[PDB]
Amino acid sequence: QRTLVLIKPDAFERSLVAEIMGRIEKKNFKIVSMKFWSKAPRNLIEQHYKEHSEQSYFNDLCDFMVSGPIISIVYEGTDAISKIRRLQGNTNPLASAPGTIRGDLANDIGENLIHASDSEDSAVDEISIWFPE
Amino acid sequence: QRTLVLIKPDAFERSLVAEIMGRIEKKNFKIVSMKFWSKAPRNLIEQHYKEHSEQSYFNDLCDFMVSGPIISIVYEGTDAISKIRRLQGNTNPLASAPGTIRGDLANDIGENLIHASDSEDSAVDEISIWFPE
Amino acid sequence: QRTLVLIKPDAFERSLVAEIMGRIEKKNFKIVSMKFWSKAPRNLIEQHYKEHSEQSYFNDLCDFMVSGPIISIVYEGTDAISKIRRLQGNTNPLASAPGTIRGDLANDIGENLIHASDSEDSAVDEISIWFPE
Amino acid sequence: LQRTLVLIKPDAFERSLVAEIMGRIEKKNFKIVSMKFWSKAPRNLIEQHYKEHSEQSYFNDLCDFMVSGPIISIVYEGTDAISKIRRLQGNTNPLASAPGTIRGDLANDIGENLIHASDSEDSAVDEISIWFP
Amino acid sequence: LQRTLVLIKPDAFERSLVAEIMGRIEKKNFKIVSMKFWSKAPRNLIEQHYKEHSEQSYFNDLCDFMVSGPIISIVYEGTDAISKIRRLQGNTNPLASAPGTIRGDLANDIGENLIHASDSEDSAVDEISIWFP
Amino acid sequence: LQRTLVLIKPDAFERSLVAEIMGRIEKKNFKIVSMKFWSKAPRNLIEQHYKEHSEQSYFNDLCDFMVSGPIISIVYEGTDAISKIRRLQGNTNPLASAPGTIRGDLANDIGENLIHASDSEDSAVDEISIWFP
Ligand SMILES: Nc1ccn([C@@H]2O[C@H](COP(=O)(O)OP(=O)(O)O)[C@@H](O)[C@H]2O)c(=O)n1
Ligand SMILES: Nc1ccn([C@@H]2O[C@H](COP(=O)(O)OP(=O)(O)O)[C@@H](O)[C@H]2O)c(=O)n1
Ligand SMILES: Nc1ccn([C@@H]2O[C@H](COP(=O)(O)OP(=O)(O)O)[C@@H](O)[C@H]2O)c(=O)n1
Ligand SMILES: Nc1ccn([C@@H]2O[C@H](COP(=O)(O)OP(=O)(O)O)[C@@H](O)[C@H]2O)c(=O)n1
Ligand SMILES: Nc1ccn([C@@H]2O[C@H](COP(=O)(O)OP(=O)(O)O)[C@@H](O)[C@H]2O)c(=O)n1
Ligand SMILES: Nc1ccn([C@@H]2O[C@H](COP(=O)(O)OP(=O)(O)O)[C@@H](O)[C@H]2O)c(=O)n1
Ligand SMILES: [Mg+2]
Ligand SMILES: [Mg+2]
Ligand SMILES: [Mg+2]
Ligand SMILES: [Mg+2]
Numbered sequence: 001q002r003t004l005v006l007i008k009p010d011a012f013e014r015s016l017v018a019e020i021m022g023r024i025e026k027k028n029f030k031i032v033s034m035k036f037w038s039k040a041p042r043n044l045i046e047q048h049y050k051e052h053s054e055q056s057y058f059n060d061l062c063d064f065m066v067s068g069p070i071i072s073i074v075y076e077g078t079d080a081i082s083k084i085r086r087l088q089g090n091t092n093p094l095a096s097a098p099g100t101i102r103g104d105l106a107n108d109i110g111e112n113l114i115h116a117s118d119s120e121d122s123a124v125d126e127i128s129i130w131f132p133e
Numbered sequence: 134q135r136t137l138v139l140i141k142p143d144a145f146e147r148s149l150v151a152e153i154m155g156r157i158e159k160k161n162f163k164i165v166s167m168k169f170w171s172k173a174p175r176n177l178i179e180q181h182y183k184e185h186s187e188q189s190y191f192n193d194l195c196d197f198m199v200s201g202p203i204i205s206i207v208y209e210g211t212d213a214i215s216k217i218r219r220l221q222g223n224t225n226p227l228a229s230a231p232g233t234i235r236g237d238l239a240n241d242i243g244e245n246l247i248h249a250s251d252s253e254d255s256a257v258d259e260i261s262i263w264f265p266e
Numbered sequence: 267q268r269t270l271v272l273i274k275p276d277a278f279e280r281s282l283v284a285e286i287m288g289r290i291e292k293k294n295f296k297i298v299s300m301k302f303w304s305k306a307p308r309n310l311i312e313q314h315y316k317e318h319s320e321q322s323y324f325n326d327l328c329d330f331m332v333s334g335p336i337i338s339i340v341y342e343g344t345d346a347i348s349k350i351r352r353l354q355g356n357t358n359p360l361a362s363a364p365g366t367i368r369g370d371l372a373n374d375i376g377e378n379l380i381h382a383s384d385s386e387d388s389a390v391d392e393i394s395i396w397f398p399e
Numbered sequence: 400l401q402r403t404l405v406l407i408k409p410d411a412f413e414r415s416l417v418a419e420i421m422g423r424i425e426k427k428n429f430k431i432v433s434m435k436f437w438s439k440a441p442r443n444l445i446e447q448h449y450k451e452h453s454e455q456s457y458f459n460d461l462c463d464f465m466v467s468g469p470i471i472s473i474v475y476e477g478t479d480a481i482s483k484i485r486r487l488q489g490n491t492n493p494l495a496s497a498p499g500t501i502r503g504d505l506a507n508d509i510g511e512n513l514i515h516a517s518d519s520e521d522s523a524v525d526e527i528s529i530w531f532p
Numbered sequence: 533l534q535r536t537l538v539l540i541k542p543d544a545f546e547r548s549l550v551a552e553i554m555g556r557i558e559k560k561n562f563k564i565v566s567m568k569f570w571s572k573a574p575r576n577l578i579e580q581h582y583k584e585h586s587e588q589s590y591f592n593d594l595c596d597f598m599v600s601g602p603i604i605s606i607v608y609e610g611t612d613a614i615s616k617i618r619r620l621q622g623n624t625n626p627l628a629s630a631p632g633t634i635r636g637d638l639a640n641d642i643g644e645n646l647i648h649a650s651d652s653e654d655s656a657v658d659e660i661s662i663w664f665p
Numbered sequence: 666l667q668r669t670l671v672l673i674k675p676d677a678f679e680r681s682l683v684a685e686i687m688g689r690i691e692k693k694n695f696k697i698v699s700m701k702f703w704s705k706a707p708r709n710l711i712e713q714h715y716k717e718h719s720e721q722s723y724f725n726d727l728c729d730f731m732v733s734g735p736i737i738s739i740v741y742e743g744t745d746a747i748s749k750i751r752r753l754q755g756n757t758n759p760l761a762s763a764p765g766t767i768r769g770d771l772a773n774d775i776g777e778n779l780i781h782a783s784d785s786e787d788s789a790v791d792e793i794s795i796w797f798p
């Protein structure tokens with residue numbers, strides 16, 4: 001499987017980019033594609049998060065995602081989608097488990113360091129958004 | 134919220150002080166106050182652990198807590214009390230989860246490296262004990 | 267208690283030997299005996315895994331275990347058997363928890379870095395296999 | 400303020416040291432301003448990158464190595480980035496690279512040495528225009 | 533056996549490197565004998581600390597920086613603590629600090645350089661009496 | 666390609682630095698070819714190991730220290746293993762061992778200095794035949 005991961009602007013701000021990538025790297029997942037964005041276009045962000053367009057946090061979320069750089073990465077591995085989701089940790093700081101990326105490093109439900117596709121369907125979708133080629 | 138954390142004498146003995154503080158630091162909690170005690174007065178210890186005065190381990194616990202230095206720290210952050218408790222890990226070595234401080238580092242129910250307040254009520258209480266000002 | 271741990275050939279291949287040993291070392295378990303095997307004899311491997319002789323993976327498993335070096339280690343500590351099992355993590359990569367050795371480092375149900383005895387009975391047994399003296 | 404061109408070499412991918420190397424540069428507070436992942440760099444880019452070495456005995460082996468796995472090309476930005484990152488990198492020769500340097504700690508071969516860093520202002524501008532034209 | 537005075541500078545807090553720096557000194561087996569957290573050090577303590585620099589061009593900027601965030605003052609104890617910790621610290625100038633040193637690995641500015649360490653026996657005694665009178 | 670003899674000294678066990686030290690050599694890509702755990706090395710092996718020092722003032726204290734806890738004897742293999750691992754090791758004198766070296770980062774005593782490494786081809790062959798006859 002291939003999954004789409006984003007390193008979010010807060011990781012750059014907090015100098016955690018290598019930390020997060022290294023956790024996935026140490027689990028033996030392989031980078032298939034990678035793009036550095038000094039600032040992602042808002043439209044890309046809005047597409048990526050289209051399922052959230054009616055949520056009260058939608059605009060703050062979009063602002064945050066264009067507030068700094070992003071790295072988009074396609075990772076490949078057996079069951080990569082579910083596995084990276086478990087490494088990522090829960091969105092909520094009251095739930096993300098110590099040992100996960102978010103459990104160890106993130107303290108906010110919004111600024112939470114990392115995106116990972118949550119299903120095969122959304123992976124295909126998100127990979128096409130960030131890597132249309 | 135603010136929570137009271139103690140680095141216990143075993144952390145000093147095992148050179149784990151930075152390791153433990155760094156875990157909390159990496160989760161983005163801010164130090165509000167901090168005190169180094171070369172040896173905490175026994176009365177302080179007894180006050181801190183007053184709810185345990187009738188337990189069979191009470192005296193050994195007090196002896197341990199004055200057996201070496203302690204750092205008392207007030208940490209501040211959203212939901213800091215519950216969050217630091219989860220990072221800390223369960224008291225019992227048969228239960229504390231890998232990824233938590235105790236799960237990774239502690240092997241004894243007594244010498245377990247770190248105290249953290251378990252509720253808002255006890256936080257206020259413990260902060261007043263270690264930082265009466 | 268004493269438990270038998272094997273560092274498997276994949277750990278050597280991936281340069282993870284110190285990483286894994288260090289996790290157990292940091293939990294304060296003591297090495298009682300240790301043997302380095304440039305290649306374990308197949309018969310030893312087959313004895314170690316005798317309960318799996320009827321599984322479809324038995325032969326591939328034996329081939330893997332002689333494909334590179336192994337370190338056998340006897341660790342000692344209170345409840346060392348169950349504790350090291352929890353640090354190890356589940357066999358299945360879909361289940362092993364971030365924070366465990368396998369959850370963090372292993373991505374395959376076969377090549378999973380580390381063996382640890384699962385009970386007192388099997389510990390005694392496995393210790394006698396690797397350390398017959 | 401300067402920009403320098405870094406390549407993460409194919410041995411870094413093979414040995415799972417990508418984040419380790421990027422992390423050392425990150426902790427030194429250098430900022431990524433461009434980055435491209437190459438599953439396999441074109442021979443000609445490599446030969447152009449090392450055009451100074453084209454008549455050297457090791458040229459063909461060097462170019463072969465450089466196309467034997469993925470690379471990442473990165474432009475780093477910071478005050479005196481060029482000399483400072485050269486210092487982090489360490490000497491080409493494993494007999495001379497100091498512990499604490501990337502190569503001193505991690506590399507054990509004069510050829511397979513994990514990282515390229517531009518060695519001057521002029522070469523930085525040249526290399527940057529090769530990888531990011 | 534000697535005592536030396538270390539300050540963790542405000543940039544360390546900003547960049548979440550407090551435990552990282554303390555940890556390097558801890559792993560070298562130096563013992564904390566005094567420690568005080570300052571949410572903001574008094575200007576006058578800072579000016580007294582750096583009184584030697586009072587006529588230097590950078591004095592006002594230095595003092596401003598030093599009161600721009602928290603600091604920790606620490607007295608470390610050990611055999612030849614003064615010269616040894618100075619060695620860990622690394623050169624003031626980022627063009628000269630060796631990789632493997634605190635500043636060589638972590639600092640990228642001559643001013644914002646993370647840590648102060650007493651540079652001699654006499655200055656150690658002076659500085660210790662400033663921060664711990 | 667060379668082989669060198671390393672001893673992990675009893676202070677490494679006491680301070681839980683076994684994996685830390687082995688890990689530095691591992692990351693440098695040196696391969697273990699022999700390894701033996703000694704819960705307590707025989708006095709005579711130690712005295713033979715250091716026979717060059719037999720008339721030195723520190724000999725008895727050195728031998729006493731060396732039998733005061735476990736040691737691991739390891740034969741490492743790699744290109745120029747002898748000089749390269751000596752470089753990792755760092756100077757005997759804590760006034761001289763460079764940060765980034767094993768001793769520079771970790772050791773704070775001329776006697777208790779964590780690791781032995783053969784210092785030449787001839788001494789490597791001698792020491793290897795002592796520990797692995
Ligand atoms: N209550 C919420 C939920 C999500 N969000 C943001 O929206 C993104 C997550 O929506 P999601 O439910 O798909 O969460 P993840 O898959 O990112 O865990 C998060 O990563 C947050 O940045 C938020 O700011 N507040
Ligand atoms: N069975 C027990 C329970 C607690 N204790 C000690 O008493 C303190 C804990 O009591 P507690 O139930 O408040 O535990 P924590 O909040 O520290 O996890 C522990 O940190 C131990 O040092 C003990 O020695 N034996
Ligand atoms: N479905 C399976 C189950 C086990 N195995 C192998 O057989 C060994 C495990 O059998 P086990 O159930 O005793 O697992 P652990 O105790 O090693 O977790 C594993 O470590 C794998 O190397 C496998 O290759 N495929
Ligand atoms: N004697 C040599 C010199 C360089 N080389 C290789 O080709 C590159 C030589 O470039 P260089 O001399 O500019 O060394 P660096 O600047 O990469 O340290 C090195 O990175 C090695 O990969 C080699 O294989 N043998
Ligand atoms: N040229 C300089 C020299 C020092 N400084 C600052 O003021 C302090 C100078 O003290 P120093 O020369 O005793 O340097 P260290 O002993 O801190 O390495 C440094 O830590 C810098 O923060 C500066 O900003 N510019
Ligand atoms: N002045 C000295 C020199 C060495 N020694 C000890 O004995 C060994 C001396 O051997 P050496 O001079 O060959 O030093 P290394 O090669 O171990 O760095 C050291 O590892 C110290 O443990 C000492 O205690 N005092
Ligand atoms: Mg989602
Ligand atoms: Mg409690
Ligand atoms: Mg089993
Ligand atoms: Mg060059």
Ligand SMILES: [Mg+2]
Pocket residue numbers: 649651
């Ligand atoms: Mg100074």
Ligand SMILES: [Mg+2]
Pocket residue numbers: 782784
């Ligand atoms: Mg010697």
